[PDB]
């Protein structure tokens, strides 16, 4: 689902929609949400609503718009998971970062903005959140369950503002050696935090997932809100 009429234009003239949640009160910091491989779906709707309830405005851009506008896949359906994996395989990460940078610029200019913008990414969005933190577009970045972080360690010293990462300890995408590489690499830059959730799998914070772990999701989410709170006026 996207908000009708919202259109954000990127570096190369590509435009895309977004689901937008205005804040309960103005002004407010704005959180750009980088979605999973499944697009702007029920979990994104829940995430916008949650951040609005917590004193933010939120903007979830349609990152699959270069491939197919309005992707909103339900992870309960095998056919829809299959379409998501096909979209991910083809997804241009660099163009994703560009679209997120455009969404952040859009977020800064919203009429109720207090001048501060954060980014929170899940899955696909978690890996994009690290890349955006390296570019420095945002005031604070958060990434849940990003894949392939161990292949981006050269970017650790590029991070110049705080970024927080939540990672499952039983995430098959991040096996023991990868976890070790990420832990040692990220540890060199005190602007970064990486927290591991022992006993929790890849989608431990996604409501409805068979991977969901309430205790872990609760702790990660509490940490996220405490990390974002300094952006509030």
From Swiss-Prot:
Hydrolase found in the keyword field: yes
A Pfam match: DLH
Enzyme class, spelled out: hydrolase
Metabolic or biological pathway, per its Swiss-Prot or TrEMBL entry: Aromatic compound metabolism; 3-chlorocatechol degradation
Record SUPFAM superfamilies: alpha/beta-Hydrolases (SSF53474)
Active site, per annotation: 123, 171, 202
Coiled-coil annotated spans: none
Protein name in UniProt: Carboxymethylenebutenolidase
Protein's UniProt keywords contain Hydrolase: yes
Catalysed reaction, written as an equation: 2-(5-oxo-2,5-dihydrofuran-2-ylidene)acetate + H2O = 4-oxohex-2-enedioate + H(+)
InterPro entries noted in UniProt: AB_hydrolase_fold, Dienelactn_hydro, Dienelactone_hydrolase-like
Self-association state and partner proteins as the record states: Monomer.
Sorted UniProt keywords: Aromatic hydrocarbons catabolism, Hydrolase, Plasmid, Serine esterase
Further information: Carboxymethylenebutenolidase is specific for dienelactone and has no activity toward enol-lactones.
GO biological process: catabolic process
Disulphide bridges, residue numbers: none
PANTHER family given in the database record: ALPHA_BETA-HYDROLASES SUPERFAMILY PROTEIN, CARBOXYMETHYLENEBUTENOLIDASE-RELATED
GO molecular function: carboxymethylenebutenolidase activity
Function: Ring cleavage of cyclic ester dienelactone to produce maleylacetate.
Family affiliation: Belongs to the dienelactone hydrolase family.
EC annotation from Swiss-Prot or TrEMBL: 3.1.1.45
